[PDB]
Symmetry: none
Subunit: 129 residues, 2 copies
């Protein structure tokens, strides 16, 4: 019976459960910017895989130097002598066999046919196995 004790000018019905807002905001560029991003996909490809992959890149030209440095380290020792002496000729395994054909180059020599009886034994005549 008693409702609204004031005379209105136009029929209306303000909000009660929902607020339609009676004032258009100002910040509208913040939406069109974030909205364009959503659909527009920029993230792609694996950047982490390519990043670490660079390691091997510089690791190739780098080791190339360190690799040669090693040989240079023992270069001083190599030139030096400690074991494996090289003086006599008998030590040479090739010599013996080479001595055979050596009979031609020199041609002249002492005891060629007689000395030949030595190597001929190394040949060893086989029959079957």
């Amino acid at each position: 019976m008693f409702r609204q004790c004031a005379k209105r000018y136009a029929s209306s019905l303000p909000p009660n459960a929902l607020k339609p807002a009676f004032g258009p905001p100002d910040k509208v560029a913040a939406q069109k910017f974030k909205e364009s991003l959503m659909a527009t996909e920029k993230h792609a490809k694996d950047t982490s895989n390519m990043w670490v992959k660079i390691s091997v890149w510089v690791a190739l030209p780098a080791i190339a130097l360190t690799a040669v440095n090693t040989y240079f380290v023992e270069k001083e020792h190599a030139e030096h002598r400690e074991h494996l002496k090289h003086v006599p000729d008998s030590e040479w395994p090739r010599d013996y066999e080479f001595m055979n054909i050596r009979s031609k180059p020199f041609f002249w020599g002492d005891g060629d046919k007689t000395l030949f009886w030595n190597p001929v034994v190394n040949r060893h005549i086989e029959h079957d196995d």
Copy 2:
């Protein structure tokens, strides 16, 4: 006279969709920049400069071993001093012929006489067949 009214219909609705409006050049370039200056400042990054910057970081450790290698080879003659007599003869092109001409200056030398029997091959030619 006049009879222009603003609100006549008792049922209005905000235009959901609008119509296109073409015309003269709008130029979105000058606006793209003016928009950034509006609130935010100019700003200027330089992450790319980090690529060359790191170059020095890795250039320190690398050159470290490189520098040490410089003295390493120098230690060669250092440790093994006293070297009046040469060695490489076939390597150095000059050496070979040099040993021949040196036969005079030296005058007296042991081992050069017999060895001289080899270089002579170059002096005289050999015609076979």
